[PDB]
């Protein structure tokens, strides 16, 4: 809605979608936060009720089973909390507290059960949400998710050593890192349980599927940095200003153009990926299943765009 944060293409071409389960989603999530004691009451209130953070997921994973959606939103809520601890350990120098948390998250990620009632709340909460996401598809999917999140936490570690030492990463260095601390591939994985199917490595690694999955995440990551730029360390504008010596009203234009480019590139590959889907329906049953899944996944990749865009303006 602000002029400098406005994207006419999103407004004209990416209608908001809202999952039917959204009302209960907020409730069950705020309830869960209290259950697991991951956050003070006041903060829970403003997270799920005040700023309705579960709406982010509710405009994203359309067609997801209610229980799958709930699991996702819990994870995302936990994520929020972890993101707050990370930030806190940083402005405290709690490198010991942080390192041990890091080691434990790695541990829990591989064996969630053993950690459901672990002393550290953040750890037990995480382990519950992970354990729940692990109950929808084959262990191969579960294994891929862990392999992806292991990297995410390591990325969060490097960002820790970046923001203490006060190291502003190179332009490309950050871009690579953000794909990780933003958990691009976790979200991409979570599309699959939503559509009730683990895509074969072949299907999900098709140039169009993977490029579409990527642009969706880039847009979300870079629009995030655009909104938060004037505020200010980690941000695409900050990296541009520091290493390309760009100015604010310059780095703001560059990030903005890069965001706009994600939209129009996605429009292009989106079409490639839906062609791909059409082709997957060979006539067989398994084929029609693979076609619908990819299609629902591309649709949610498209939904991320409006979900993230409109979330920021509310």
């Amino acid at each position: 809605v602000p002029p400098s944060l406005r994207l006419p293409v999103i407004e004209a071409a990416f209608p908001r979608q809202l999952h039917p389960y959204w009302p209960k989603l907020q409730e069950t999530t705020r309830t869960w936060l209290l259950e697991k004691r991951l956050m003070p009451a006041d903060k829970v209130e403003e997270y799920a009720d005040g700023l309705c953070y579960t709406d982010l997921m509710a405009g994203y994973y359309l067609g997801a089973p209610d229980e799958v959606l709930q699991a996702i939103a819990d994870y995302s809520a936990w994520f929020f909390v972890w993101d707050d601890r990370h930030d806190r350990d940083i402005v405290h120098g709690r490198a010991g507290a942080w390192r041990r948390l890091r080691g434990l998250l790695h541990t829990a990620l591989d064996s969630p059960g053993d950690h459901l009632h672990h002393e550290d709340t953040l750890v037990a909460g995480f382990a519950d949400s992970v354990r729940r996401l692990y109950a929808f598809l084959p262990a191969t999917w579960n294994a891929r998710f862990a392999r992806h999140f292991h990297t995410v936490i390591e990325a969060y570690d490097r960002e820790f050593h970046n923001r203490t030492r006060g190291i502003v990463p190179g332009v490309e260095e950050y871009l690579e890192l953000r794909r990780l601390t933003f958990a691009h591939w976790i979200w991409t994985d979570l599309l699959e349980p939503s559509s009730g199917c683990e895509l074969p490595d072949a299907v999900r690694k098709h140039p169009a599927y993977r490029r579409a999955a990527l642009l969706s995440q880039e847009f979300a990551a870079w629009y995030n940095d655009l909104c938060s730029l004037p505020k200010e360390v980690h941000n695409l504008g900050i990296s541009l200003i520091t290493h390309h010596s760009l100015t604010l009203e310059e780095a703001i234009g560059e990030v903005r153009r890069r965001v706009e480019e994600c939209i129009t590139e996605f429009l292009a590959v989106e079409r490639d990926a839906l062609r791909f889907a059409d082709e997957l329906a060979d006539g067989t049953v398994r084929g029609k299943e693979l076609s619908g899944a990819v299609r629902a996944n591309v649709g949610n990749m498209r939904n991320w765009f409006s979900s993230v865009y409109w979330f920021h303006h509310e």
Side-chain angles (χ1 to χ4, degrees):
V1 299
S4 65
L5 296 180
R6 158 165 281 94
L7 301 178
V9 181
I10 302 294
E11 287 173 359
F14 289 72
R16 314 190 58 172
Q17 314 268 35
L18 189 62
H19 202 279
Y21 181 75
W22 74 275
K24 189 67 193 98
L25 189 64
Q26 312 190 187
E27 177 96 22
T28 310
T29 287
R30 99 85 164 87
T31 284
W32 182 84
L33 295 180
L34 297 178
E35 304 296 9
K36 301 295 193 173
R37 299 188 38 173
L38 285 168
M39 210 165 56
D42 33 73
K43 298 220 61 181
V44 170
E45 292 264 31
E46 78 162 344
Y47 171 92
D49 295 352
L51 302 174
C52 315
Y53 261 91
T54 64
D55 283 8
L56 207 7
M57 299 301 107
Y60 183 15
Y61 291 108
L62 281 299
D66 300 352
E67 35 275 340
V68 182
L69 187 60
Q70 189 57 61
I72 291 176
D74 291 340
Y75 171 66
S76 171
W78 172 89
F79 211 124
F80 175 95
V81 173
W82 181 45
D83 193 322
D84 200 73
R85 175 80 73 86
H86 180 257
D87 203 293
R88 174 164 163 82
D89 275 346
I90 286 184
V91 195
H92 258 277
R94 314 219 83 94
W98 162 253
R99 169 180 48 77
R100 308 189 168 94
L101 175 55
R102 154 176 177 228
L104 301 168
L105 291 172
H106 278 291
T107 320
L109 176 54
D110 294 304
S111 68
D114 308 22
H115 308 254
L116 299 175
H117 307 278
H118 176 101
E119 322 74 72
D120 183 322
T121 59
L122 213 19
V123 184
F126 166 67
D128 182 53
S129 70
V130 159
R131 182 194 67 73
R132 306 228 312 288
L133 297 163
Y134 276 170
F136 298 126
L137 301 184
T140 51
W141 190 90
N142 303 339
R144 161 148 53 93
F145 181 99
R147 171 176 57 97
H148 289 135
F149 200 82
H150 275 310
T151 305
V152 179
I153 178 273
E154 283 314 88
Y156 256 76
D157 188 37
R158 286 115 74 176
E159 192 177 316
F160 189 103
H161 303 114
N162 272 3
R163 301 222 267 101
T164 57
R165 300 162 196 163
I167 299 171
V168 176
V171 159
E172 208 62 56
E173 178 175 2
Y174 174 68
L175 291 177
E176 215 186 335
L177 179 58
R178 202 41 162 127
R179 311 194 165 100
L180 311 166
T181 63
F182 196 78
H184 285 206
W185 314 126
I186 296 299
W187 307 122
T188 307
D189 296 323
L190 297 169
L191 288 162
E192 294 176 57
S194 299
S195 50
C197 179
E198 174 191 4
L199 302 169
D201 269 14
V203 163
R204 50 177 287 265
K205 300 183 90 70
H206 179 290
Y209 189 88
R210 190 164 187 99
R211 181 69 185 188
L214 169 74
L215 292 162
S216 194
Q217 301 308 329
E218 296 289 72
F219 170 91
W222 301 348
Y223 188 65
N224 251 72
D225 294 350
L226 179 73
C227 295
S228 72
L229 193 49
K231 194 169 73 64
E232 294 93 296
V233 70
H234 286 241
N235 192 293
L236 180 62
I238 298 174
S239 290
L240 298 167
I241 291 168
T242 308
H243 297 286
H244 293 25
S245 51
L246 223 47
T247 63
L248 181 64
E249 2 79 46
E250 273 183 304
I252 279 293
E254 180 68 48
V255 163
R256 183 179 173 76
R257 291 188 295 272
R258 298 195 179 203
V259 170
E260 289 173 312
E261 282 186 4
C262 283
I263 304 161
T264 52
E265 295 195 334
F266 178 83
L267 288 176
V269 301
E270 180 188 26
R271 219 175 48 167
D272 290 344
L274 295 181
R275 282 161 176 169
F276 181 38
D278 289 331
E279 287 165 7
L280 283 159
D282 50 16
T284 77
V285 149
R286 159 70 169 179
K288 180 49 231 160
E289 172 194 294
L290 281 171
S291 173
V294 170
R295 192 168 283 273
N297 293 8
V298 172
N300 292 335
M301 295 176 201
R302 147 183 289 280
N303 285 333
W304 205 207
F305 284 85
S306 56
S307 180
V308 167
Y309 183 84
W310 291 109
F311 166 79
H312 280 269
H313 312 121
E314 66 180 28

